[PDB]
């Protein structure tokens, strides 16, 4: 994954600087597993997840099943985190996800800005902001009717 | 928000106050967005800068940024901005926020969920990228933006 033109040249921009940011960076590596059972370990009981163009999932049960539903149709082939920062229990990630659609085989580099809420080392909230139509039309896989 | 026709519901998952000089400048830039004035907003930007509403192509340089913002303000108005979360690290400011956008050709309004990032150098914006879903905005206001 190439560094975008607008990427910060601060050598520490993409590096974790707190234990919370290190956990989020480990979560980004584990995203390539496409394994909701593995990823659910990072989540607290009182938590939520939402790919913002799609309906949110509240509670650990709904988060795992929502992630598992996405992984039946798409694979996260690579995650490249350009920027990671944090303030007040929220961690922010500006990144590219290489998403591959299983039915069509096409892949696409999706620009994503996400936020992670963490208490006691566990994710109590994860929201990824991006444009869904770009990914749908890129890989020929509609996720929103 | 001082825009009584607008209403921003409190999100269930929602901290929003500035804790650094860079966060304060970004928050002041958010209040100035309701001016819908590219000539006034461009004063916050440095010479070497960029802007991109991520579903749309980016603009590099203070000239292209002012022109891109001016073009957007000819078809839409920023009626209100509420920042639920603001944070910063490595000279980058992140803002989780809803913007009430009103499309001028149709008169329809929409509350757009946005996560944005601001890179600041000596108090001036060197980068502003807002992440959001364009389609849901387009369909709610009947205004294709691509
Ligand atoms: Na960093
Ligand atoms: Na911080």
Numbering used by the authors:
A (entry chain A): 5 to 149
B (entry chain D): -2 to 11, 17 to 148
What did the authors write?
On the basis of the well-documented mechanism of ReLEH, a water molecular is positioned by H-bonds to N55 and Y53 while D132 abstracts a proton from the water, enabling a smooth nucleophilic attack on one of the substrate’s epoxide carbon center.
Several hits with essentially eliminated WT hydrolytic activity were identified, including variants SZ532 (Y53L/N55P), SZ534 (Y53V/N55P), SZ609 (Y53I/N55A) and SZ611 (Y53F/N55A). In the case of the double mutant SZ611 (Y53F/N55A), the formation of Baldwin product 2 is improved from 10% (WT) up to 78% (2:3 = 7.8). SZ611 assembles into a homodimer structure with four α-helices and five-strand β-sheets in each monomer, forming a cavity that serves as a deep substrate-binding pocket, in which a substituent of substrate 59 or of product 46 can occur without steric repulsion. Two other essential mutations, Y53F and N55A, have well-defined electron density maps that together expand the hydrophobic local space, thereby leading to the preference of intramolecular cyclization reactions.
